Write a protein that binds this ligand. Structure first.
Ligand code: HEM
Ligand code: HEM
Ligand SMILES: C[C@H](O)[C@H](O)[C@H]1CNc2nc(N)[nH]c(=O)c2N1
Ligand SMILES: C[C@H](O)[C@H](O)[C@H]1CNc2nc(N)[nH]c(=O)c2N1
Ligand SMILES: CCCC(=[NH2+])NCCC[C@H](N)C(=O)O
Ligand SMILES: CCCC(=[NH2+])NCCC[C@H](N)C(=O)O
Ligand SMILES: [Zn+2]
Lengths: 410, 407
C-alpha cells in the first residue's frame, strides 16, 4: 500500500512505503486519533523473530543479505537464545542499532544528524561507580568545550528484569526543584519529585535556583547510589540579551548539554534500560518551554515587566513579545560563548531536507507533527505546512516508567 | 473503552466516553496515525435519520415518547415513499448548532449554542441565493458587532440539482498571475479568480479586490453577483507605534464566512451552507499575511523594522511576526470590529472543553488545528491532550464544483 504526504506550501507530494514495515501500534484506531496524547522480560519465543528481523535489516544495510556471514550469525544467535534465553549484539550491530533508534525517533527534529553518533559501549559495566565513570566520560566527550558532539552510552541490557541498569535522572544534567512550604517552587518545578528522592538518599542540597542535580545510578538491579558530576565538566551559559542590558540581571543561565537518560533503547528484541544520549539544544527548548512554560521557570511576566509592555490586556500580545526577546537572548548567549545550538528556523528547514531525502532513499520518515512543530512561530517554520506520517519502527527509543515506581528496594 | 485526557500544565484529567458514539472513520489505524493530514440509498438513509432523531428527542427530554416514535415513523414512511425527507425547523436549527458543536477543528465552539440559523430551503434560483447571502452578510456583520450565523439552502436530491456556492468564503480577495511570474493579490484564490474572469467578471487587477459570488442553484450553471460594496466591511491595517505600517497598504475584511463545506444532518446533505463567526487574530496576521504562499509579507515588514535579516538566529521573522499580529488586533479593535486574540480564544476553548466533558462526556478536538500558528506553548491548548473523532451532524469538506460540474 502507498500513502501520500503533501506539503501545502510547496505542493510537493511524497510517497511512503516504509510504514509497511511498521510493527508496533500507535494508540490510534480507525475511529479515534490519539496523536496529541503524550504517551498512549521477553520470552525465547517472541525473541528470535525480533532478533531475525533486526539482523536481516543489519545485513541488508551492509549489502551482505543472504551471505554465509549473514546465515551463520542468525544460527549463532538462535543457538544462543535457546541456550541462554537471550543473546549479545556484536559491536557493529550495537552501533548500527543505536543510530537507527535515533533515525526512527519520530519526535526528533534533529535527525539529519542521525548517522553522526558516537556510541560508547558500556556493556562491561557492573556497578554504580562504574556507571558514574562512564557517564563522566560521556559528558566530557560530548561537551567538547562547547563544540558539542552527539553520543550515547549503552549499559548492560535487561535480563530477567530484576537486574536492570537505570539512570534515575531524567537527563544527565538538570537543575533541582524545591517545593517551599508557602506553595511556591525554588528552581525547576519539573524536577521536584526527583530532587526529593536525591535529598532522601543523602544529597545535601544547596537549595539554590540553579543547582545541578547529582546522578542517582542503579547498577545490576541494586539500590541506586548518588554521585556528583565534577563541576568542571558541567558547561553552563549565563543568559544575556544583545540589546537589553538588564536581561543578565534576571540571573538566568542554562546548561549546554541536553542528555536524555530515562529512555529505553530496543534493538533486535533486546532492551537497554540505561542508555543516556545527547546532542545539542534547539533554542526553543530552553527559551520557550523550560523558561516560559507556566509549570517550569515561568519567567514571562518578570521579563515583560522589565520591557514595560502593556500587560493589562492579552491583545497587546505582551506574552508573545516577551517570548521572542527571551529566545533571542538564549541563542545570542550560546553563540557568544561558542556553545553549539540551533534555532528553530534552521532546525526545521534542515529536517524537511532530511525528511525528503529519507522518502527517496528509505521510502519514508515516521514523524510526529505535534512534536516536530516548534512551540513558537509554528506556521513560519516549514514543518507546519508538512503533512507527516507517524508510526513505530525498531530499533527505537521508548518511554519507561520512572524507576522509583517499580524498584524493589534491598 | 473509556479514554482519559490529561492537561500537562494543570495535571487535570478528563475521561472521554462521547467517542464511543463516533461512527465515521478517522483515517488513522493502529499502525499509522494521519493526524497531520489536511484531509485523510433509502436503506442508508433511515438509520442515519434514526440516529439523528434519537439524539434530538433525547436533547429535548422526550426520548422514547409518543412524539418521538410518531416522528420516527413519519420520517420512515417519507423515506420509503419519497426516498428522502424534510427536517422540521426545530430539527434544522438543532442540527446546524450541533454540526458546529462537533467541528473538531474549531477553537471557538464555546459559542456553539449562539447561532442564528437562516432557513433558505425555499430558495430556487441563483438570484434568490444572492439575496439570502446579502442578508446573511448584513446580519452577521452588524456594523462591526459580529453575530454568528449560517444560511441553509436546499438539500441534495439526485446529485444533479445541487446548490453550491463556488467561492471558498463569501468574502475573499482575488489573485492573478502576473507577467513577472509573481502573483498579484491572494495566491490562494488565483484559480477561482480565473473561473470568474473566464465567466465574465471584470477583474480590477488590484491587490485586495473583493471577489464576486459565483452561485449555483438546482444544479444549473453558476452566476456572478457583486456583493453590495456597502455590505462588505473592511479594516485598514495600522500599527499602534509604527506609523510606517499603514504605508504597507494592508487591509482585511471583517467577516470570515466559510462557504464551500457540506452540512450533514440526519443523513441529509446541505451542499450550500455558508456559515460565519468572527476572526481570531492569527488567522489573518499569521496565516493570511505571512504564509509564504499567501500575501507573504514578512520580509517587507522586517525591512521597515530595520533588523538583521542576515541570520535566522536573530529571530527577525519572529519579531516581525508579533508586530504584524499586534497591528491586526489593534486595527480591528480600533474600528470596533469584533476579533479575538489567540490567548483569549484558547483560554475559552479550555473552559468549553471542560464544560463539554462534564455535561456531554467529551469534546472531539483536532490538536493540530486548535493550537494557534504562533506562540503555541504559551497558550493552554498546547498542553491539553485531545481526542479527535467524527460525530454527526457535521461539516464536511467536499469537491470544488468546477471539478464536478457539467455545464
Ligand atoms: C544533534 C542535536 C539534536 C537536536 C537539535 C535534536 C532536537 C530534538 C528536539 C527539539 C526534540 C524535542 C525535545 C522536547 O520537546 O523535549 C527531540 C526529541 C528527541 N530526540 Fe532529538 N535532537 C538531537 C539529537 C538527538 C540524539 C543524539 C538522539 C538520540 C541518539 C535524539 C533522540 C530523540 C528522541 C528519542 C526524542 C524524543 C524524546 C522524548 O520523547 O522526550 N535526538 N530532539
Ligand atoms: C464566533 C467565532 C468563531 C471563532 C473565533 C472560530 C475560530 C475558528 C478558527 C481559528 C478556525 C481555524 C480556521 C483556519 O485555520 O482556517 C476555525 C475553523 C472552523 N470553524 Fe470555527 N470559529 C468561530 C465560529 C464558527 C462558526 C459560526 C462555525 C459554524 C457554524 C464554525 C465552524 C468551523 C469549522 C467547520 C472549522 C474548520 C474549517 C476548515 O476545516 O477549514 N466556526 N474556527
Ligand atoms: C498535550 C501535548 O501532546 C503536549 O503538550 C506536547 C505537544 N508537543 C510537544 N512537542 C515537543 N517537542 N515537546 C513536548 O513536550 C510537547 N508536548
Ligand atoms: C500539514 C498540516 O496539517 C497543515 O499545515 C495544518 C496544520 N494546522 C493547521 N491549523 C489550522 N487552524 N489551520 C490550518 O490551515 C492548519 N494547517
Ligand atoms: C538528546 C537530544 C538533545 C535535545 N535537543 N533535546 C533533549 C530534550 C531536552 C529538553 N527539551 C530540555 O529542554 O532540557
Ligand atoms: C466561519 C468561521 C469563522 C473563522 N474564524 N474562520 C473561518 C476560516 C477563515 C480563514 N482561516 C481566514 O483566515 O480567512
Ligand atoms: Zn492518529
Amino acid at each position: 500500500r502507498f500513502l501520500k504526504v503533501k506539503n501545502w506550501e510547496t505542493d510537493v507530494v511524497l510517497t511512503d512505503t516504509l510504514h509497511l514495515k511498521s510493527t508496533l501500534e500507535t494508540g490510534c484506531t480507525e475511529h479515534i486519533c490519539m496523536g496529541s496524547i503524550m504517551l498512549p522480560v521477553r520470552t525465547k519465543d517472541q525473541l528470535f523473530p525480533l532478533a531475525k528481523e533486526f539482523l536481516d535489516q543489519y545485513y541488508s544495510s551492509i549489502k551482505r543479505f543472504g551471505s554465509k556471514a549473514h546465515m551463520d550469525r542468525l544460527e549463532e544467535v538462535n543457538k544462543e537464545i535457546e541456550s541462554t534465553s537471550t543473546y549479545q549484539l556484536k559491536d557493529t550491530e550495537l552501533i548500527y542499532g543505536a543510530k537507527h533508534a535515533w533515525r526512527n525517533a519520530s519526535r526528533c527534529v534533529g535527525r539529519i544528524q542521525w548517522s553522526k553518533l558516537q556510541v560508547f559501549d558500556a556493556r562491561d559495566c557492573t556497578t554504580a561507580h562504574g556507571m558514574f565513570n562512564y557517564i563522566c566520560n560521556h559528558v566530557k566527550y560530548a561537551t567538547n568545550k562547547g563544540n558539542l558532539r552527539s553520543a550515547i552510552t549503552i549499559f548492560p541490557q535487561r535480563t530477567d528484569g530484576k537486574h536492570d541498569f537505570r539512570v534515575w535522572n531524567s537527563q544527565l544534567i538538570r537543575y533541582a526543584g524545591y517545593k517551599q512550604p508557602d506553595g511556591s517552587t525554588l528552581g525547576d518545578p519539573a524536577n521536584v519529585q526527583f530532587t526529593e528522592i536525591c535529598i532522601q538518599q543523602g544529597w545535601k542540597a544547596p537549595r539554590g535556583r540553579f543547582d545541578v542535580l547529582p546522578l542517582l545510578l542503579q547498577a545490576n538491579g541494586n539500590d541506586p547510589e548518588l554521585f556528583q558530576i565534577p563541576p568542571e565538566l558541567v558547561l553552563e551559559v549565563p543568559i544575556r540579551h544583545p540589546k537589553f542590558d538588564w536581561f543578565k540581571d534576571l540571573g538566568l543561565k542554562w546548561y549546554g548539554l541536553p542528555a536524555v537518560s530515562n529512555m529505553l533503547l530496543e534493538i533486535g528484541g533486546l532492551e537497554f534500560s540505561a542508555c543516556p544520549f545527547s546532542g545539542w539544544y534547539m533554542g526553543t527548548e530552553i527559551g520557550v518551554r523550560d523558561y516560559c512554560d507556566n509549570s517550569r521557570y515561568n519567567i514571562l511576566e518578570e521579563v515583560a515587566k522589565k520591557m514595560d509592555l502593556d500587560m493589562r490586556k492579552t491583545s497587546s500580545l505582551w506574552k508573545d513579545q516577551a517570548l521572542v526577546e527571551i529566545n533571542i537572548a538564549v541563542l545570542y548567549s550560546f553563540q557568544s560563548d561558542k556553545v553549539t545550538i540551533v534555532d528553530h528556523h534552521s532546525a526545521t528547514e534542515s529536517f524537511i531536507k532530511h525528511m525528503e531525502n529519507e522518502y527517496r532513499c528509505r521510502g519514508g520518515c515516521p514523524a510526529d507533527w505535534v512534536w516536530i512543530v516548534p512551540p513558537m512561530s509554528g506556521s513560519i517554520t516549514p514543518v507546519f505546512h508538512q503533512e507527516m506520517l507517524n508510526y513505530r519502527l525498531t530499533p527505537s527509543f521508548e518511554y519507561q516508567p520512572d524507576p522509583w515506581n517499580t524498584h524493589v528496594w534491598k
